[PDB]
């Protein structure tokens, strides 16, 4: 066993009844003085390194050609001047195993952390040396972390796409289904997770040109998509991951759910395609009143009204659907469907739950389209227009397929540096650059939506780490007050940066004029309610930083009205799974699953303590499963009120609790304004 492995395992060997957390630090030293420094490839100077990486097809030469070598040297020197040290063994291990650039045979390490950060910063700046240094300082301080696609692939010749998630709308036609399968394979080839809205597809037993009971429903398309994602599995490196979203009022909703039952037959079971359910407020109202609900056949509704079932408001059209004899429907028990959802989430963690009305009551771009589904991580909530892929030799009507670039603020590092504004603006600029340089030649709706919406996702990580390292319980009202203030600041500065980009470029996102940003409605709660901290401890935490007031929000509203906004969507809180290790941060705004996690790598086992875990903050690092899910819902709703897109909200459940407890948590989330629920992980 390696020396650093033994040093890391020495953490759990208690001394005087206490964990040896400091041993972890020793491990990193070993991991660098025995493996990383020996396995790294050193050159005489930076010129030889850059030339070797360029000619050997490791780096794209275009982004490096925008800078003179003196500027690149200055950027690299700025990166190395911080003398960044990984405080935990797992941070360095995760970076050098998942994100550091290696040779073709993967026998040596070509990129250090500073090298990777410098390359990403130079790609972000697009020829601006000062901007590149700003990005270097932002990432080496670990205030901002680009998503895994962006951080791993920026400036690389053998790179994939920098966009993490893609959302596709599938129209009810064989041509559209085949095009959706093709685009899903193309985007999984690019490495991104693909989500498909199957609510427009007509249910099982519908007519294909006057021959009835002919359609296979959404389950056949689900099987096709599952095989497509199995085939396109990132060249066999990462398993192809897809998501299917169906409205709960679709007739196939049961069969949909039956794809995830552990007793499902092979002709129905789907195993590589995640499932999500979109629940309008009408379904929750029907379940609450115990009135029997009706699921609908989408094609009959489309024939009668000319629009898809998910294209209009069910809260106002459900009674018209039910009373219409030309609309076909089936009777269901909404409470039984809710119990089935809870049982399925207990068994397998599926489906994702999207509260459609919670998303669309604060959605700023309802004029473009209502949000009808979410992404594979159930945090992207954007307007999408379905595409009409016609026959060959016929022009296709290209719609809008959602796609946003992810980037997370490290809350602990951002607040320690007292740089919410600067970090938010620089992250917005980096995400705007990632969107601008993204061009996908096989997904036309994705390309058009990227060019028009200009949507980005700016997330946050290390919420629980910051709260526990500052002596604040994650479930406490003080923690929710901190989240309210911090994310109001993040939203304020993201809107300010979006408006500044719109002013400097003279262009807004497409159809911005009909948005609530243009009409000023979006700023209502920000121009009437003060989001400054209500607790003295939180206010002290925010000292040295100008917390925006109602007057600052009014000025920002006027600025947006004058100049517009460059981005249709700005903030989305992704799960941030593996890149949180490198940043020494807790995953996303979720509470920690465990204080010390035991992970098996190779034939060895490693223990990763939570960042900053110690004796004095052991009980502030409360495990998520031990927490009240209602207070976690309260925290997520408090954050969500300042996030325009959704938050990947994983439910952390105990084995003792029943499906009724899961249903109660889901209904409280819906009541509190939670937009989406990601996972039901049971301990």
């Amino acid at each position: 066993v390696p020396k650093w492995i033994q040093l890391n395992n020495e953490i759990m060997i208690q001394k005087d009844g206490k964990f040896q957390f400091d041993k972890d630090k020793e491990a990193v030293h070993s991991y660098f003085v025995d493996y990383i420094n020996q396995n790294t490839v050193f050159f005489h100077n930076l010129k030889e390194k850059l030339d070797y990486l360029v000619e050997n097809q490791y780096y794209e030469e275009e982004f490096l050609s925008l800078y003179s070598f003196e500027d690149i040297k200055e950027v690299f020197k700025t990166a190395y001047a911080k003398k960044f040290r990984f405080p935990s063994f797992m941070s360095a291990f995760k970076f050098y195993n998942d994100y550091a650039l290696k040779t073709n045979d993967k026998k040596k390490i070509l990129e250090r952390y500073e090298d990777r950060i410098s390359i990403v910063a130079l790609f972000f700046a697009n020829g601006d040396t000062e901007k590149a240094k700003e990005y270097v300082n932002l990432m080496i301080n670990q205030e901002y972390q680009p998503s895994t696609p962006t951080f791993l692939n920026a400036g690389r010749k053998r790179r994939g796409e920098l966009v993490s998630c893609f959302l596709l709308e599938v129209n009810d036609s064989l041509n559209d289904i085949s095009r959706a399968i093709d685009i899903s394979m193309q985007l999984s080839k690019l490495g991104g997770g693909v989500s498909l809205n199957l609510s427009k597809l007509r249910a099982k037993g519908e007519a294909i040109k006057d021959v009835e009971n002919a359609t296979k429903g959404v389950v056949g398309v689900m099987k096709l998509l599952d095989n497509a994602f199995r085939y396109a599995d990132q060249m066999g490196q990462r398993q192809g991951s897809g998501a299917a979203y169906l409205n709960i009022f679709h007739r196939d909703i049961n069969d949909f759910l039956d794809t995830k039952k552990i007793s499902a037959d092979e002709d129905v079971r789907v195993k590589t395609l995640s499932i999500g359910v979109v629940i309008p407020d009408k379904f929750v109202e029907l379940a609450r009143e115990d009135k029997a609900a009706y699921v609908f056949y989408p094609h009959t509704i489309y024939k009668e009204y000319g629009q898809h079932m998910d294209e209009m408001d069910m809260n106002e059209m459900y009674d018209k659907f039910v009373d219409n004899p030309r609309v076909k429907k089936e009777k269901i028990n909404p409470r039984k469907l809710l119990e089935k959802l809870a049982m399925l989430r207990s068994e397998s963690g599926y489906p994702y739950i999207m509260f459609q009305d919670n998303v669309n009551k604060v959605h700023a771009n309802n004029h473009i389209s209502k949000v009808k589904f979410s992404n594979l991580c159930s945090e992207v909530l954007q307007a999408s227009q379905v595409s009409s892929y016609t026959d060959y030799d016929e022009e296709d009507e290209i719609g809008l397929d959602i796609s946003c670039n992810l980037g997370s603020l490290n809350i602990l590092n951002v607040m320690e540096h007292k740089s919410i504004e600067k970090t938010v603006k620089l992250a917005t600029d980096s995400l705007t650059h990632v969107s601008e340089t993204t061009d996908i030649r096989n997904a036309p709706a994705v390309r058009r939506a990227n060019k028009a919406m200009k949507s980005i996702g700016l997330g946050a990580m290390n919420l629980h780490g910051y709260l526990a390292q500052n002596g604040i319980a994650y479930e406490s009202p003080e923690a929710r007050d901190f989240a309210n203030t911090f994310f109001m600041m993040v939203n304020f500065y993201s809107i300010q940066r979006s408006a500044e980009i719109a002013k400097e470029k003279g262009e807004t996102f497409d159809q911005y004029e009909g948005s609530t940003y243009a009409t000023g409605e979006y700023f209502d709660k920000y121009v009437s309610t003060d989001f400054s901290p209500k607790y003295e401890k939180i206010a002290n935490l925010f000292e040295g930083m100008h917390i925006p007031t109602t007057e600052d929000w009014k000025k920002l509203k006027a600025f947006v009205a004058e100049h517009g906004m460059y981005h249709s969507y700005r903030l989305c809180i992704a799960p941030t799974g593996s890149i949180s290790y490198v940043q020494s941060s807790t995953a996303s705004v979720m509470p920690i699953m465990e204080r010390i996690e035991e992970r098996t790598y190779g034939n060895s086992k490693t223990y990763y303590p939570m960042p900053g875990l110690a004796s004095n903050n052991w009980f502030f690092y409360k495990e998520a499963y031990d927490m009240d899910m209602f207070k976690v819902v309260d925290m997520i709703a408090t954050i969500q009120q300042h996030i325009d897109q959704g938050i990947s909200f994983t439910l952390f459940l105990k084995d003792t609790m029943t499906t009724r407890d899961l249903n109660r948590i889901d209904l409280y989330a819906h009541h509190r304004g939670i937009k989406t629920i990601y996972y039901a992980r049971t301990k």
Partner: protein, 289 residues
Amino acid sequence: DFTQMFYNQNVKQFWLPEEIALNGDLLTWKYLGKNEQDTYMKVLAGLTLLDTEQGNTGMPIVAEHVDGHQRKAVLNFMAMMENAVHAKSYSNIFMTLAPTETINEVFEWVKQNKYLQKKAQMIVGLYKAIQKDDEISLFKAMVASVYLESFLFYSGFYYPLYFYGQGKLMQSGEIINLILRDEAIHGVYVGLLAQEIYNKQTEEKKAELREFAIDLLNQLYENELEYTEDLYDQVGLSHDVKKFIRYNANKALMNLGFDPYFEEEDINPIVLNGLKATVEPLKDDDFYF
């Protein structure tokens, strides 16, 4: 945790003797020496005689005393393979290679042979000693069964595999390989049923059952060494056959959840080439907060 999985593997391995044409073996059989032909005949008769005991007694007696419908079905399937498939396959090989009078004489010889009889009767004795509702006696019989399936057959399988790995007697070698593949899964399955009984016992009773298993293994092993020299010295193979016996003894022990008894040895390369959360209804007022 395992019966449905073994059901699947068993039924998908189904085969019939008629599938392999045997006549083309006569083209290599005619080129073997008298000692090679003699050893082959004797080994074949040994396997045939032991497998008949397993079909008539071993599998059906275990199926009788084991509780569980699905286990009884798997065990019935295994008994069927012994009686309907394996027994016919051995007969077919014999009828192809030897005339009727030669077959009768070889079986007369092997029937009187001291080392074959010793092991055959030791195994049969344990099957006859099973008592209704006594899981200890059932376990002892299961140990005997695993030793037959995963260990005792292999002093015999060696020779057909040795020829098969050299390009000789390929049709009968293919048949033997299919038989052996069935006995392997039979041994693993019965082994899991024995471990289930073993795990229900006290620590003292466990130690006592371990001593039983090791003592039985020792008796059978010492007789296998004699059986081996008796058959294989005339063709110069006994040293390598002994390594193969020990290697398979270790597999049999592992099937019973026990540690290997013998040190690891390499095997003859020619033979190697041959080889649910609680559902609680919503009570209303869960929609109000």
